[PDB]
Amino acid sequence: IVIDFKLNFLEQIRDNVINLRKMVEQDEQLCIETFSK
């Protein structure tokens, strides 16, 4: 068988900053529960 713009650079920079803080909080909460065991 074979098989069968928005031009938003400031929004992109803000996107990336908030995503990075999300990641930092994620691992900051991971180590909180791991390091106590």
Binding site: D27, E28, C31, I32
Partner: peptide
């Protein structure tokens, strides 16, 4: 402090 460890680690290993 377990959250200061993570900031120190994230600035020492930022690059």
């Amino acid at each position: 402090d377990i959250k200061a460890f993570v900031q120190k680690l994230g600035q020492r290993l930022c690059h």
